[PDB]
Amino acid sequence: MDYTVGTYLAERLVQIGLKHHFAVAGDYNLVLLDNLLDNKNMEQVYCCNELNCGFSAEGYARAKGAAAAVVTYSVGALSAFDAIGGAYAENLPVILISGAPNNNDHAAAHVLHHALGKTDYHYQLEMAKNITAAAEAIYTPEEAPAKIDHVIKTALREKKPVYLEIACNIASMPCAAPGPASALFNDEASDEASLNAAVEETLKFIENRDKVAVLVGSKLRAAAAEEAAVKFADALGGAVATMAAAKSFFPEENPHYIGTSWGEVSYPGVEKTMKEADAVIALAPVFNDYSTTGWTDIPDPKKLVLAEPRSVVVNGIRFPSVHLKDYLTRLAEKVSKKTGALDFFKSLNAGELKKADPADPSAPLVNAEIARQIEDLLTPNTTVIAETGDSWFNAQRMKLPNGARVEYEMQWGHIGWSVPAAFGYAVGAPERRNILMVGDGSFQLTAQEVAQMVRLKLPVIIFLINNYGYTIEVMIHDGPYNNIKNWDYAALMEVFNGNGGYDSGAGKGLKAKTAAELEEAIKVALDNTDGPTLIECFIAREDCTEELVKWGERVAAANSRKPVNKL
Amino acid sequence: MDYTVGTYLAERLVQIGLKHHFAVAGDYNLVLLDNLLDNKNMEQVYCCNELNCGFSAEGYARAKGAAAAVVTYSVGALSAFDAIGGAYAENLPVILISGAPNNNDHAAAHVLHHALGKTDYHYQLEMAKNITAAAEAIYTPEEAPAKIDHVIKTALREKKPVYLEIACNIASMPCAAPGPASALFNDEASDEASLNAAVEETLKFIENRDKVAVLVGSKLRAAAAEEAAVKFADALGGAVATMAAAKSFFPEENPHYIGTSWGEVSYPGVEKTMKEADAVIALAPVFNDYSTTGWTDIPDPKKLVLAEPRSVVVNGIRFPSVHLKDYLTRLAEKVSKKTGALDFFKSLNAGELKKADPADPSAPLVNAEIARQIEDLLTPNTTVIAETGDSWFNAQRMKLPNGARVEYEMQWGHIGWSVPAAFGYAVGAPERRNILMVGDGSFQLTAQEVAQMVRLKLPVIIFLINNYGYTIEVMIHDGPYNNIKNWDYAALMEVFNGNGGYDSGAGKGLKAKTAAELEEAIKVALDNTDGPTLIECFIAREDCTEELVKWGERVAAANSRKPVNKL
Amino acid sequence: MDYTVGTYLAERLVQIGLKHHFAVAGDYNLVLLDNLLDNKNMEQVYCCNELNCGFSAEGYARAKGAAAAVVTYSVGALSAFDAIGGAYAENLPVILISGAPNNNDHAAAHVLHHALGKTDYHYQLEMAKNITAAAEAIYTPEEAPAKIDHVIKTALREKKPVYLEIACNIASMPCAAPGPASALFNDEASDEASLNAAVEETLKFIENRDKVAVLVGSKLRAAAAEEAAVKFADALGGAVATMAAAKSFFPEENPHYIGTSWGEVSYPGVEKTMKEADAVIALAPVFNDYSTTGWTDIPDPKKLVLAEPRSVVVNGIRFPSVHLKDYLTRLAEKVSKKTGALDFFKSLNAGELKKADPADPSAPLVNAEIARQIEDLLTPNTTVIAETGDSWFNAQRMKLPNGARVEYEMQWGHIGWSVPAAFGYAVGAPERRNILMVGDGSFQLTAQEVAQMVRLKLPVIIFLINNYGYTIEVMIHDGPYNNIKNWDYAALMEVFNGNSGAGKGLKAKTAAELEEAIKVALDNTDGPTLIECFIAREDCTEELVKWGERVAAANSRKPVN
Ligand SMILES: Cc1ncc(C[n+]2csc(CCOP(=O)(O)OP(=O)(O)O)c2C)c(N)n1
Ligand SMILES: Cc1ncc(C[n+]2csc(CCOP(=O)(O)OP(=O)(O)O)c2C)c(N)n1
Ligand SMILES: Cc1ncc(C[n+]2csc(CCOP(=O)(O)OP(=O)(O)O)c2C)c(N)n1
Ligand SMILES: [Mg+2]
Ligand SMILES: [Mg+2]
Ligand SMILES: [Mg+2]
């Protein structure tokens, strides 16, 4: 096979496991989209706008491990940067590829469409560098293979997005062919002395600390260490809790799992157990303002073993070049049984998380009953995409059967992420039962991507929580800016179906205002195999989780804290 | 009055003539939105998402001369950058204001929500610098007045957008009060020797060049020179044509106006007249790939007097510090009558632009009949917002009564601009008859802002041209990426009306598939004073202007031209 | 004439008043330098290295108002960027012009010499943006006129440096001709309503505040407001003090001048007078960690009228678009006598700054005796260039006759600035008596530029203070890094003469030898004279010792939490 710039790119994308890429056409990328189309192992999937394109790829990367979005110069790329910064924040290897000017137009005093009106076309690459792990511009075909391979290998190694731009007049130009896929995953092994030392220091730290807790963090999947963490936890026999953003990164039917650790909104018993543990082994955590409940819940530095994806800090020593999967595997082999924290937890009799009983059939639907019927739908083959909003807290409360997944975007927190993310996740994982839980406010930012779920016949079940505005903001600091224009969300499904011809779309929009209506809507949803089903769930503005009220206050307090003295 | 950081900002915004600013709430900006709310001379207007917020402000600036958009850190700002780069490209002073972290969180090793996961919060400011004329971060209240005043004065002087970020814990902090508004508009006068010299060189250039044409450019309004250009044109008595993006920047009922100059898609006679003029006086032009019809129509460097907003290049000499309004005023006083090109044009008998007759009532609607009935609606109090797409060419063909305005975004060309731009323009110019002409493809990127037109009861008349995909791209280079998922656009209006209660919205969605149905829909539209009216106009995919086909080919040719030899 | 990119630039430089520009050749700028040589209204002056080239321009801008430096791509420009940041810090319009790659090598996958080994040639320009007021790359001739005019106007407007790069294959290419010089000096006027209101608010503020002190700041010359400050001071009749970096920006023989304000190292009576004043009118100040003596001396916000070059903050109102020269001119016309702080100062009997009597001729030379003899050299036609180090404090103690200038680089504080800065200043102001006061440590960074003073026959008198290392650092925080390799500094003159040069190098180890050396220096009209003065490491001003401790305490203060 002879390759071109564009087919080289396509082949590399297929080699890292992509079966799809996402795109929005524009004149600087059309020839490149033609070359990408030429690859018989990938589908090209079209999006409504470039933010949504970016977020669709982000969601795909959650299903498949990586993804790619293709956009046009400047007008496409700048909005897509928002999503790419999201991918950086969520440790996902999304490859952003932009069209770019004709290579003759550089340093030529040419003013070009889509650009600033100046004759300088480096600004986009410049901007990209701030929000990616690698960023390259391809101006000539000879430089294409090296630049492509560099950004792909970096994305996969770092679990971060990357940027490529390609001149619009070279995508069909010949270049070298790509070598074997195995080269792209090539990575450092753990330094063996370091691995051994980190594990041994961990044993010397816990030799006389029998109450050991394990804190599962939101970078565990990025480190491909989820399986190793179960092995470690089973050997240790300690208490295992998840940070809020790590929901589903540890099997909840495992007898060592005690629930969520999230400060004053932890599951019952957990906060106590963590306070009175002698050692906390944290596996790939992100400690931020949200995850620490407005800086009120910070791990005790005297007890913390900090095992990150590529380093361990233990017993006052930093060990770089120790991969978490390797650390956990070896530690699982060497560690003795340390059941103390878990014994402490059970002796608490703090009970299980208190959950409401089934609602009466005709009563007004409430937040707690929606959460109950959703929890009832969960299977080992289910993924729930949970938006920023009260849905964060509802999803957190659900008991997951082993195998069920939850997808959160808690580090970036872009409301509206969820709709294109669920689209892209559903493209990538069509075998799964894919459930989207999204608030009305969020939905409005990105709603149009539901039309793509319709176009592709994806059977996503969408729970749209219609509480008439931004209830999480209401619980941080209220004002007129938290009110939104209400829509007939259910009716939007018919809009996306088109001229309404039978072949034009099989989306369904339903309304649920009672428990009985919700039951019946769920039934219709599960039977709709040809398209998405949006269930518009009606509840009161302030009918939210107890957790949200408490977390919201501590967040408003951290954000507003006064400046300290600087002289 | 005692001021705070935030009320200082609000007051400056009011002083430059804003009566509105646009916003999307988020926790890093809520206190700042409260301070901005405290100003009794401005409305705070909420948007669905941050791209749309940015574009709403862009549209407002077309109505009012400047604008402001307020967004949250990182998740809001990065998408809004797309719109801000648009404002830069279209020479509009939009002030982007972002919320930002608590000022205690800098250089503190704190990981914060909405950010990349790192502990460095300068990246947004860095990115902003590439697409603005000034960009400042406010970390302390003492630095607020200077930074605010700097970015505002720069925006107004340069007719370019600017960036401010404000730490979330200082918006209510006291600071100095603002001085008089007059300080903000303070600008250089023309250098008198330069002004005199530029005008005199222009007379010596045209002394023996009697066939003088005037080419009105898309930076004429930015230079506030529209009125001066009429004075000059009337004194000269030459032929005056507009570049495509300068439609409505010169009164079309003026007897010296000959139509559009746009290469092979010029109005009849114009191309000939420009070829055989001896001098072309270009007033604030932008010569780009689109405006030159894929580089096939470049002005003759031997004939060109180049009068830009702040400089004139004439008779081989560059004169900086000569303001276009001043140049035109003085030139109008000194120039003799030079009627030659206009005499040449009339002697062409090239006739007027050929326009179709009224359609039969029941026949399938065609592109040309939509253009006809829209042209029939134009009054001196009308503005037409014309999207990138075939709507560029339809709008170009319309005969404007003096006073009527057309708004184009031809330099940036972000499809979807038009919907939030029309929202913001209609907020700013509610007295006008505001008409939006938008294609189906474009509409899908930003459709949700129609809900804000509903919320605010704005009587915008929207002509949605439903030709089942991206017809302009079809005419550049066709592929599967130009097909889109069709919607029931008309039905979307009921969605935005909400629970459909009488007080919930007065948007109307109508369908037009024949000339008669279009007439009747226009009537209903004009009678709907309480909300927007969307008229979904159905036509064939390839039923487009002749102009688009011709321009599309030359553009595809310029974009794809082969690389030249570099050694 | 027909213009080229290069000659357009040349003409613009001549229009802004340059009679010289400074250069270091390299293959990417040679054509450009030829084009600059076409214009015979300025001379092209060559420098040893690009750091020194930049600082030569910086000192020329002190003498003439603006300057230019020309360097080669990457290897020249990156080091020159330290001088350009320096110019930005010191408010000087220096135009840095770099040669750049052939315009065919952009977006071509070509690796070029002097670059990073990649194929991207935008990095220099991106770097420059961080330290300039404007920065433009010229890749085609048709774009040159607008880019050139934009950076020049910007430099003059903002009083800051700017950056241009010009592709090496386009410098001789035709372009449009430049218009009138007048266009380049077209600044906005003050907003009249704001000017009037700011003056009116100032008159309100001081209505019942008779004890009015005037604090003269280091951005007064950038504001072109020195003459206006004298008019205001003469009308007001209050006490005037200069900030350290503003030495010579106010005539010291004026009866309203009370000396230096600089915290605990102020002239006697000044610190008290400032504390007693009811209003302090600060004229273009820069309040930084050094100028506030480690943040120990900050103006009382309740008494401060802050008149910056382009704005005034007074009575809790900010007034942009008010130019200080105009503010001072108007205020001088309107203000009534406010003598109270000057009465207070006199009433104090604090005395004049105490200064040492002549030393015993044959005793070992001491720092105070060096300062006394230099002070005795000062005339109205004198400029002293004072290096970072104890020379800052010795110069600060000198009583200037009206007309005498001091050049300081206190914001940037790059040791070694003084040598090429004195070279460039002496090229721009050859009529003046130009004295360089420079320490041994500083001298060693940039010494080679004395060879250019020899080449051009500039009669710069150089007092090299040989105190065997970095005393200013000894007095902040001592360690082995303050010791340097000693040189025979006097013998360096002969090296720079070659085997063709009239530099003189002399040694002074007593007061009599210093007296004799200075006579020889004054008689040497054909080249520079370096006088190597030997003093003990710790023989420094008392002021350095006090200010040093305060700086160290500010630098090392603990993180707050
Ligand atoms: C793009 C973006 N803009 C603004 C915000 C700030 N923000 C955080 S949660 C929220 C409200 C979400 O409302 P909804 O989706 O209705 O969920 P609810 O809180 O009502 O449960 C907002 C505006 C954000 N996170 N991202
Ligand atoms: C944000 C953005 N993405 C992609 C493009 C490329 N583009 C230019 S015109 C066009 C099609 C617009 O289609 P429509 O609005 O339906 O107008 P029609 O051409 O059918 O008249 C596209 C995708 C763009 N200009 N801006
Ligand atoms: C380029 C540069 N490097 C390092 C420093 C730090 N520094 C400040 S003063 C000084 C010593 C000055 O030595 P000298 O010129 O001998 O003067 P003295 O202090 O002995 O009077 C140093 C190293 C600096 N200011 N600039
Ligand atoms: Mg909500
Ligand atoms: Mg269309
Ligand atoms: Mg020394």
Residue numbers in the entry:
A (entry chain A), B (entry chain A): 1 to 567
C (entry chain B): 1 to 499, 504 to 565
Could you share sentences copied from the article?
A significant increase in thermal stability is observed with PDC2.03, which combines PDC1.01, PDC1.10 and the additional four substitutions. PDC2.03 contains sixteen mutations in the monomeric unit and sixty-four mutations in the homotetrameric complex. The mutations are found throughout the PDC complex as well as in each of the three structural regions of the monomeric unit. The structure of PDC2.03 was refined to a resolution of 1.67 Å with R and Rfree of 0.170 and 0.203, respectively. There are two molecules in the asymmetric unit in complex with TPP and magnesium. Each monomer has three domains with an open α/β topology with several ethylene glycol and sulfate molecules on the surface. The backbone root-mean-square deviation (RMSD) between chain A of the wild-type PDB and PDC2.03 is 0.19 Å. The largest conformational difference, located in the upper left of Fig. 5c, is located at a crystal contact point and distant from both the active sites and any of the 16 mutations. Thus, the mutations impart significant enhancement in thermal stability without unintended structural alterations. PDC2.03, which displayed no loss of molar ellipticity until 90 °C when monitored by CD, lasted 60 min at 60 °C before entering phase 2, and never entered phase 3 for the duration of the experiment.
